[PDB]
Amino acid sequence: STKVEALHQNREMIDPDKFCSLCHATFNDPVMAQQHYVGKKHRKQETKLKLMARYGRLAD
Ligand SMILES: [Zn+2]
């Protein structure tokens, strides 16, 4: 995970490190990050976690 640090913008695009708190997933490229945030697995797990948190109010 140390990576071959160079960041040479001559032909390579910007590659920020990113994370998803709904799916517990990490990304290290622009398209990798973007693809996660719009994929079926992100939608499905977002609904699952949202339902778990919303319905979890079993006491008052
Ligand atoms: Zn996600």
Curated annotation (Swiss-Prot):
Zinc finger map (Matrin-type): 15-49
Residue intervals passing through the bilayer: none
Cell compartments where the protein resides: Nucleus, Nucleolus; Cytoplasm
Covalent link location (Glycyl lysine isopeptide (Lys-Gly) (interchain with G-Cter in SUMO2)): K3
Domain comment in the entry: The zinc-finger domains are required for binding to dsRNA, and also for nuclear localization.
Description of how the protein assembles with itself and partners: Forms a heteromeric complex with XPO5 and ILF3. Found in a nuclear export complex with XPO5, RAN, ILF3, ZNF346 and double-stranded RNA. Interacts with XPO5. Interacts with ILF3 in an RNA-independent manner.
Its job: Binds with low affinity to dsDNA and ssRNA, and with high affinity to dsRNA, with no detectable sequence specificity. May bind to specific miRNA hairpins.
Protein's name according to its UniProt entry: Zinc finger protein 346
Organism for this UniProt entry: Homo sapiens
Entire-sequence positions represented here: 168 to 227 of 294
